[PDB]
Design an enzyme around this catalytic site. Structure first.
Site, PDB file in Angstrom:
ATOM      1  N   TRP A  29       0.873  -1.180   0.000  1.00 59.16           N
ATOM      2  CA  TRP A  29       0.000   0.000   0.000  1.00 59.16           C
ATOM      3  C   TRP A  29       0.927   1.254   0.000  1.00 59.16           C
ATOM      4  CZ3 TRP A  29      -3.800  -1.017   4.677  1.00 59.16           C
ATOM      5  CH2 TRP A  29      -4.739  -2.024   4.289  1.00 59.16           C
ATOM      6  N   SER A  30       0.662   2.104  -0.997  1.00 57.01           N
ATOM      7  CA  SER A  30       1.485   3.326  -1.117  1.00 57.01           C
ATOM      8  C   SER A  30       0.750   4.410  -1.829  1.00 57.01           C
ATOM      9  CB  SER A  30       2.791   3.033  -1.836  1.00 57.01           C
ATOM     10  OG  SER A  30       2.552   2.570  -3.153  1.00 57.01           O
ATOM     11  N   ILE A  31       1.171   5.668  -1.580  1.00 62.65           N
ATOM     12  CA  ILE A  31       0.712   6.825  -2.352  1.00 62.65           C
ATOM     13  C   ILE A  31       1.699   7.059  -3.473  1.00 62.65           C
ATOM     14  CG2 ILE A  31       0.187   9.252  -2.383  1.00 62.65           C
ATOM     15  CD1 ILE A  31      -0.546   9.118   0.481  1.00 62.65           C
ATOM     16  N   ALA A  32       1.157   7.194  -4.677  1.00 61.15           N
ATOM     17  CA  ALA A  32       1.899   7.682  -5.897  1.00 61.15           C
ATOM     18  C   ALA A  32       0.904   8.479  -6.692  1.00 61.15           C
ATOM     19  CB  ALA A  32       2.501   6.526  -6.693  1.00 61.15           C
ATOM     20  N   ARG A  33       1.280   9.600  -7.290  1.00 60.28           N
ATOM     21  CA  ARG A  33       0.326  10.461  -7.966  1.00 60.28           C
ATOM     22  C   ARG A  33      -0.210   9.760  -9.231  1.00 60.28           C
ATOM     23  NH1 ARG A  33       4.989  14.532 -10.184  1.00 60.28           N
ATOM     24  NH2 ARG A  33       4.882  13.909 -12.413  1.00 60.28           N
ATOM     25  N   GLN A  72      10.728   2.774  -5.605  1.00 61.26           N
ATOM     26  CA  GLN A  72       9.468   2.685  -4.860  1.00 61.26           C
ATOM     27  C   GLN A  72       8.864   1.282  -4.954  1.00 61.26           C
ATOM     28  OE1 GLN A  72      10.025   5.138  -3.061  1.00 61.26           O
ATOM     29  NE2 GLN A  72       8.255   6.521  -3.438  1.00 61.26           N
ATOM     30  N   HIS A  73       8.122   0.871  -3.954  1.00 61.21           N
ATOM     31  CA  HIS A  73       7.600  -0.493  -3.947  1.00 61.21           C
ATOM     32  C   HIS A  73       6.600  -0.730  -5.062  1.00 61.21           C
ATOM     33  CE1 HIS A  73       9.011  -1.091   0.425  1.00 61.21           C
ATOM     34  NE2 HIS A  73       9.990  -1.258  -0.453  1.00 61.21           N
ATOM     35  N   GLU A 119       4.689  20.214  -7.562  1.00 59.78           N
ATOM     36  CA  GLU A 119       5.264  19.190  -6.729  1.00 59.78           C
ATOM     37  C   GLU A 119       5.752  19.684  -5.372  1.00 59.78           C
ATOM     38  OE1 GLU A 119       8.498  17.651  -9.284  1.00 59.78           O
ATOM     39  OE2 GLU A 119       7.059  16.446 -10.564  1.00 59.78           O
ATOM     40  N   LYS A 124      16.731   2.739   0.427  1.00 55.85           N
ATOM     41  CA  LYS A 124      15.559   3.355  -0.021  1.00 55.85           C
ATOM     42  C   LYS A 124      14.996   4.438   0.932  1.00 55.85           C
ATOM     43  CE  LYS A 124      10.747   2.162  -1.277  1.00 55.85           C
ATOM     44  NZ  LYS A 124      10.226   2.588   0.061  1.00 55.85           N
TER      45      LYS A 124
HETATM   46  C1  LIG Z   1       2.124  11.762   1.146  1.00 55.99           C
HETATM   47  C2  LIG Z   1       2.388  11.694  -0.273  1.00 55.99           C
HETATM   48  C3  LIG Z   1       3.373  10.750  -0.692  1.00 55.99           C
HETATM   49  C4  LIG Z   1       3.764  10.771  -2.028  1.00 55.99           C
HETATM   50  C5  LIG Z   1       3.178  11.612  -2.902  1.00 55.99           C
HETATM   51  C6  LIG Z   1       2.100  12.574  -2.545  1.00 55.99           C
HETATM   52  C7  LIG Z   1       1.728  12.540  -1.159  1.00 55.99           C
HETATM   53  C8  LIG Z   1       0.579  13.403  -0.689  1.00 55.99           C
HETATM   54  C9  LIG Z   1       1.508  13.335  -3.677  1.00 55.99           C
HETATM   55  C10 LIG Z   1       0.459  12.351  -4.403  1.00 55.99           C
HETATM   56  C11 LIG Z   1       0.695  14.588  -3.411  1.00 55.99           C
HETATM   57  C12 LIG Z   1       2.501  13.593  -4.703  1.00 55.99           C
HETATM   58  C13 LIG Z   1       3.290  12.532  -5.112  1.00 55.99           C
HETATM   59  N1  LIG Z   1       3.615  11.664  -4.226  1.00 55.99           N
HETATM   60  C14 LIG Z   1       4.395  10.355  -4.733  1.00 55.99           C
HETATM   61  C15 LIG Z   1       4.963   9.603  -3.723  1.00 55.99           C
HETATM   62  N2  LIG Z   1       5.819   8.594  -4.084  1.00 55.99           N
HETATM   63  C16 LIG Z   1       5.985   8.204  -5.446  1.00 55.99           C
HETATM   64  O1  LIG Z   1       6.630   7.275  -5.750  1.00 55.99           O
HETATM   65  N3  LIG Z   1       5.258   8.941  -6.321  1.00 55.99           N
HETATM   66  C17 LIG Z   1       4.443  10.011  -5.996  1.00 55.99           C
HETATM   67  O2  LIG Z   1       3.848  10.571  -6.947  1.00 55.99           O
HETATM   68  N4  LIG Z   1       4.809   9.847  -2.426  1.00 55.99           N
HETATM   69  C18 LIG Z   1       5.775   9.317  -1.480  1.00 55.99           C
HETATM   70  C19 LIG Z   1       5.521   7.761  -1.219  1.00 55.99           C
HETATM   71  O3  LIG Z   1       4.147   7.634  -0.701  1.00 55.99           O
HETATM   72  C20 LIG Z   1       6.452   7.337  -0.108  1.00 55.99           C
HETATM   73  O4  LIG Z   1       7.780   7.439  -0.670  1.00 55.99           O
HETATM   74  C21 LIG Z   1       6.213   5.916   0.312  1.00 55.99           C
HETATM   75  O5  LIG Z   1       7.317   5.483   1.134  1.00 55.99           O
HETATM   76  C22 LIG Z   1       5.988   4.956  -0.827  1.00 55.99           C
HETATM   77  O6  LIG Z   1       5.561   3.649  -0.273  1.00 55.99           O
HETATM   78  P1  LIG Z   1       6.484   2.363  -0.456  1.00 55.99           P
HETATM   79  O7  LIG Z   1       7.595   2.582   0.577  1.00 55.99           O
HETATM   80  O8  LIG Z   1       5.555   1.227  -0.060  1.00 55.99           O
HETATM   81  O9  LIG Z   1       6.996   2.359  -1.896  1.00 55.99           O
HETATM   82  C1  LIG Z   2       6.912  14.483  -5.099  1.00 57.09           C
HETATM   83  C2  LIG Z   2       6.341  13.547  -5.997  1.00 57.09           C
HETATM   84  C3  LIG Z   2       6.672  12.252  -6.163  1.00 57.09           C
HETATM   85  C4  LIG Z   2       7.589  11.428  -5.338  1.00 57.09           C
HETATM   86  C5  LIG Z   2       7.680  11.713  -4.016  1.00 57.09           C
HETATM   87  C6  LIG Z   2       8.465  10.970  -3.080  1.00 57.09           C
HETATM   88  C7  LIG Z   2       9.117   9.783  -3.648  1.00 57.09           C
HETATM   89  C8  LIG Z   2       8.994   9.499  -5.011  1.00 57.09           C
HETATM   90  C9  LIG Z   2       8.258  10.309  -5.851  1.00 57.09           C
HETATM   91  C10 LIG Z   2       5.223  14.048  -6.908  1.00 57.09           C
HETATM   92  O1  LIG Z   2       4.426  13.178  -7.371  1.00 57.09           O
HETATM   93  O2  LIG Z   2       5.050  15.201  -7.206  1.00 57.09           O
HETATM   94  K   LIG Z   3       4.357   2.480   2.198  1.00 56.01           K
HETATM   95 MN   LIG Z   4       5.908  -0.621   1.012  1.00 58.29          MN
END
Ligand SMILES: Cc1cc2c3c(c1C)C(C)(C)CC=[N+]3c1c([nH]c(=O)[nH]c1=O)N2C[C@H](O)[C@H](O)[C@H](O)COP(=O)(O)O
Ligand SMILES: C/C(=C\c1ccccc1)C(=O)O
Ligand SMILES: [K+]
Ligand SMILES: [Mn+2]
Ligand SMILES: Cc1cc2c3c(c1C)C(C)(C)CC=[N+]3c1c([nH]c(=O)[nH]c1=O)N2C[C@H](O)[C@H](O)[C@H](O)COP(=O)(O)O
Ligand SMILES: C/C(=C\c1ccccc1)C(=O)O
Ligand SMILES: [K+]
Ligand SMILES: [K+]
Ligand SMILES: [K+]
Ligand SMILES: [Mn+2]
Lengths: 500, 500
Positions: free
Chosen positions: A166-170, A187-188, A279, A388
């Protein structure tokens, strides 16, 4: 359901906290919702709940902005984060990060499967929705798409079934039934995608759940270890097994109270235009579109009166600072300790745009190591920048025990006065770099490599005999009895509340 | 006499401004006066006027603390500095620094000699005073002496008579009739002392005037050029010739309204213990005494009800930040422009403990230079770090036109997001270093050499085609009409004064 276990209850909690503004008149998802949220975040105001969104139909959707942003008062500054975790609203950052780390030496508590939940109240099959017809926000005027996904949780599972991440990615809307988004190393979501690509047989089963349990979205934002299923970590953290329901079109499991669920596949072959996006570092580069990962949506399920959380991210302070930075710092603290480094505390100063992490050293332990700055910096940087958890961080600042790393003024003071440029630093060019920092992806050097530094703000005697100064401040430059006299006579003499 | 021309009037001005607390009950110069002042400075409170100092006799002396420190409100934050210069109390830092630079392309207005003034109201010959019997403050608990001199002006003249320098340098009581203090290169008091030492014939005629015209103490704190007599610079700045009276025991001239004047000699041969002192970077190193310059006092003259100004210096914010840093920055701005560099603005961020200066670049001009970061950084650093105006500054941060260098949050944002560590920096090891910074004099390398850096926070296209981003902030990410709508509806919707 408790607030930390159910997003709908979380919203109630914000209301009860006097930390919510409900906007019941029409608001445009084209820029207006996000502009209001941006202003909230820049001013540490109450979170906005947009109950009357222009283009909302058949219950999709309301928007909550600024779910993890800061409150104005010092006493409850991190209260919104505390509400994700069942902590008192006055909880310190140390207490929040300790809660997020707590599950790291507990047995997981795996999730419990239940037959239904609120997320199944309504559904739309692939003949009944069109993503381009939903009130998806345009968050920044130059964004390359409407970013539906800024605060939901992607769910993907390894091919062998043994790890569900479970993770946040845009992600942004591509067309009626597809999204594009960032899926990048290390990223995972990327690591799992690569496993399916090597297998080569199918697209990745996927779900994206919005308005998940708050404790789950916090873990979704934290770099817990490879191979660790977030659901079980969140169960251990909260002391309870999370209740999940099976998707309708695949065998993934989503939180029972999710507000909105998209079910479908992440392609192992296709890409589409993605970005630009405003960003976390405070920028957008208009026109910088690049190919991203492509998701196909087959089904939508959602709660009655569904609420979509949204991060209007950019300049300070929003979820990308409070959550990305702080949670990375937490994981770095633990990583250092597991590598026998004498680190007590870590935090990503907001002033650094969460590109630094300050590491507080137990200098008694350091002294016993009988080491030097050069050696120690190299050890710390090797551990962190090769992992990481260090991905997003480009500068580590080592500070001694007198510095509160959760206070950016103090970190800046120590950095500026105790770290000699060049001599007291070690540069790291052969490590993974974070391309989203402007000086990386839009800078003078390789986007993906180098640009990292360990800055040693430990003074020389901190490695040998102990601190050999006193601060020239009220606290340290005057005896206790004097200080107290001054304080007791302060208003009497003519000079100028905690909660506020 | 106007406030900028007479210290006694300045004190009145502070009262009228509601920027003064008069303390009429007994206060101990042993730590208590300075502790109260320290707390003022850390909280941006009203300046303290100690009218009942324990050990005050025969009119020597009252104390004014925090004469050049900050006010609480944003609107008049620099009001105390504005009151040194006849500027409105709402004056910006840009306006203050422009006023301080104004005389640099004006003819001097030399001083006018008058037969007497308030500073002659009382006198004490060398059989009638003892410096150890005056209420000289102990400013920090670990100081190595009682620092009488924290906000007076040393007056020394070249042997040939052609340059009379006014400057602040610390000094402490050694014995009944001597002080010790810092006289260090490249400072003008040191440069003049060296001229007399090479001549080898006598000690340097000297005076130390406390409670001088405020506009004069500001010039005393600024690195105006070698060979330029401060009195004539201050005359040009203010538009008026300063009124000076001859010393009784030598032929130097002091401001007619000086509160207290010491007359005597700075030895070309003798030294004595000096320090430690709690210093501008926020530290004291207890026990670090070293030999300093030695001053002999032959006569004291003083006003009725004389007031001694005092700086309780250390951690933010006091005169060592507001005056040393800002005035150095001003001089650096001018120096850069005179060397044909496209610098519009300069400021020493308080967050850097005034060890950085941020330089705002006119990027249109930069583009026409058709240069690169490496070349430009080297040029800037050579100009600044090889000059006395750059002495105190260890990091220069180059920023483009979108950054307000007077706003530390914005400087920190640009530094952290636009300057790639290592690659976008040039280190300078063969320049004079400032030993008072802890990482210099108490650090790992040479105290007096190196440790300087130019950090380029210009983005690549700023050298070529122009800025290629927009900020992800409320201001830049949303159209004008939207922004205004949001602002106009802000309180209506439910969300939360300039003077405060
Ligand atoms: C809180 C938060 C975390 C974002 C994030 C945002 C927020 C609000 C956004 C959605 C507004 C903008 C972009 N973000 C990305 C993101 N990580 C990534 O790989 N791509 C992203 O696009 N992250 C960071 C990601 O959630 C963390 O690096 C986690 O550790 C990923 O989980 P994992 O360790 O299981 O890979
Ligand atoms: C910051 C960002 C992505 C991101 C953040 C943390 C780790 C990896 C990618 C984004 O979607 O704008
Ligand atoms: K996570
Ligand atoms: Mn993870
Ligand atoms: C405002 C201010 C300036 C101090 C100062 C202080 C204050 C309050 C103190 C007294 C509280 C602590 C120490 N200070 C010293 C000092 N310069 C120096 O050479 N020795 C000092 O001890 N300065 C800086 C010095 O005044 C500036 O560098 C001037 O440019 C020197 O004048 P000059 O250019 O004519 O040499
Ligand atoms: C800071 C300091 C002296 C100094 C300041 C600026 C330039 C030279 C010396 C002091 O006396 O504590
Ligand atoms: K160091
Ligand atoms: K001067
Ligand atoms: K740069
Ligand atoms: Mn001078």
């Amino acid at each position: 359901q408790p607030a930390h276990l159910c997003f709908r209850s979380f919203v109630e909690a914000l209301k009860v906290d006097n930390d919510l503004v409900e906007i019941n008149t029409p608001i445009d998802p084209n820029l207006e919702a996000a502009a209001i949220t941006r202003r909230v975040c820049e001013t540490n105001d109450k979170a906005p709940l947009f109950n009357n969104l222009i283009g909302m139909k058949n219950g999709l959707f309301r928007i909550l902005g600024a779910p993890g942003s800061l409150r104005k008062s010092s006493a409850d500054r991190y209260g919104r984060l505390a509400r994700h975790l069942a902590l008192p609203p006055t909880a310190s950052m140390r207490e929040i990060l300790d809660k997020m780390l707590s599950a790291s030496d507990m047995p997981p508590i795996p999730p419990t499967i239940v037959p239904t939940g609120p997320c199944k109240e309504n559904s739309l099959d692939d003949s009944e929705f069109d993503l381009t017809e939903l009130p998806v926000p345009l968050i920044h005027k130059s964004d390359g798409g409407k970013y539906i996904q800024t605060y939901g949780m992607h769910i993907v599972q390894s091919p062998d079934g043994t790890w569900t991440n479970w993770s946040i990615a845009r992600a942004m809307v591509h067309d009626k039934n597809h999204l594009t988004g960032l899926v990048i190393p290390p990223q995972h979501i990327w690591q799992i995608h690569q496993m399916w690509k090597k297998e080569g047989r199918s697209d990745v089963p996927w779900a994206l759940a919005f308005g998940v349990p708050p404790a789950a979205i916090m873990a979704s934002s934290m770099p817990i270890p490879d191979g660790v299923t977030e659901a079980g970590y969140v169960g251990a953290m909260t002391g309870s097994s999370l209740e999940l329901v099976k998707c309708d079109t695949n065998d993934l499991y989503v939180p029972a109270t999710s507000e909105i669920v998209l079910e479908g596949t992440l392609s192992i072959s296709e890409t589409g235009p993605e970005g630009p996006f405003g960003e976390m570092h405070g920028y957008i580069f208009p026109g910088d579109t690049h190919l991203g990962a492509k998701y196909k949506v087959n089904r939508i399920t959602y709660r009655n009166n569904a609420i979509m959380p949204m991060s209007s991210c950019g300049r300070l302070t929003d979820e990308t600072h409070t959550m990305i930075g702080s949670l990375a710092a937490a994981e770095i603290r633990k990583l250092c300790q597991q590598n026998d480094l004498p680190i007590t505390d870590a935090f990503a100063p907001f002033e650094s745009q969460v590109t630094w992490v300050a590491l507080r050293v137990d200098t008694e332990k350091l002294r016993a190591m009988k080491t030097t700055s050069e050696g120690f910096r190299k050890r710390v940087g090797d551990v962190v920048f090769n992992h990481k958890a260090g991905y997003t961080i480009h500068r580590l600042v080592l500070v001694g025990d007198d510095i509160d790393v959760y206070e950016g003024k103090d970190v800046l003071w120590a950095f500026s006065t105790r770290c000699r440029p060049g001599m007291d630093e070690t540069l790291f060019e052969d490590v993974r770099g974070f391309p989203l920092i402007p000086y990386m992806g839009h800078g003078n050097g390789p986007a993906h490599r180098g640009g990292k530094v360990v800055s040693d703000a430990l003074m020389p005697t901190e490695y040998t005999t102990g601190r050999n100064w006193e601060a020239a401040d009220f606290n340290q430059s005057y005896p206790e009895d004097l200080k107290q006299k001054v304080l007791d006579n302060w208003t009497k003499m003519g000079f100028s509340h905690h909660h506020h």
